[PDB]
Amino acid sequence: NLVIALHSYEPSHDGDLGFEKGEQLRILEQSGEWWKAQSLTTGQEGFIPFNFVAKANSLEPEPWFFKNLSRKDAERQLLAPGNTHGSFLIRESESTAGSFSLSVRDFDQNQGEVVKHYKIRNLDNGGFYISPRITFPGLHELVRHYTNASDGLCTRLSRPCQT
Numbered sequence: 001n002l003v004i005a006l007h008s009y010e011p012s013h014d015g016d017l018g019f020e021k022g023e024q025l026r027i028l029e030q031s032g033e034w035w036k037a038q039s040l041t042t043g044q045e046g047f048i049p050f051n052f053v054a055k056a057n058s059l060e061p062e063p064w065f066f067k068n069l070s071r072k073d074a075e076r077q078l079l080a081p082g083n084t085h086g087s088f089l090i091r092e093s094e095s096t097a098g099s100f101s102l103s104v105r106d107f108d109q110n111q112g113e114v115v116k117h118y119k120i121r122n123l124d125n126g127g128f129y130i131s132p133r134i135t136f137p138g139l140h141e142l143v144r145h146y147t148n149a150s151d152g153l154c155t156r157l158s159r160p161c162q163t
Contacts (some may be wrong), residue, residue, distance in 0.1 A: 001027045003037070003053040003055050004061070016082035017046025025053060057140065064143060074103040075115040077162050086158030090120070090139060098122040100139065102130065102146075103161075106154040116154045 001002040005023040013051055015032075019025060028045060029036035030134060037053070038045045058066055066074070078087055087105040098149040108114045118130045120142065127141055129135040131152055134144040150156045 001057050002040070003027055004056045004058075005156075006007070006052050006054055006061070006071075009048065009052055011046070015047050017044065017048050019048065022041065027053075031100075034045075059139065062090075062140070063163075064089050064137075064157075066161065070094060071101065071103075071117060074101070074117075074161075078103055078105050078115045079113055082162040086155050087159040087161050088157045088159075090143070100128070102157075104154055104157065118153065142151070 003025050004022055005019045005025060008020045009018055011018045014049050015040070017025075019039065024040040025040040025066060026040060027035055027049070028038050033050055034047045035050045035053075039046045054061060055107060060067070066089045066159075069077070069089070074089060074091055076082075076090065084137075085105050085107060086131050088103060090100050090102050093099040093101055100116040100121055104116045104118070106116045120128050120130055122128055122141070127135050127137050128139055130142070134145070134151060136145060145151070146153055147157045153156050
């Protein structure tokens with residue numbers, strides 16, 4: 001039963017478990033507002049405020065995932081300096097239930113900066129795809145695949161868009 005620390009914590013009361021942002025902890029007891037958690041590193045266990053951790057692999061903490069972004073918003077943000085070719089982000093679709101959209105910094109034929117948009121369609125049960133030939137159990141796996149090979153995308157995904 002595993003979670004990632006959202007911030008660092010230094011024990012205030014006793015019985016408290018200190019931890020650090022990004023640390024992985026297993027949850028031994030889910031009862032109340034203070035959970036009994038286990039450190040995957042040190043094997044250590046104590047009580048933590050529950051709002052300081054999240055399920056691992058959850059979508060929101062991903063540096064490439066952006067909330068409340070329209071197509072034009074994403075395009076704007078990706079064009080802004082600090083982002084270069086290959087920079088990318090994924091946002092939830094505003095017009096279609098269950099689907100997402102990938103935006104990737106690209107170059108036109110004049111070596112000018114442009115942004116390319118790809119619909120990420122959802123598969124009736126588990127997964128996601130851009131091309132129906134290539135499917136993934138989830139968005140993390142999709143991002144990982146196209147980081148490694150562009151496979152029809154304008155370029156391989158590199159740096160998540162700057163916040």
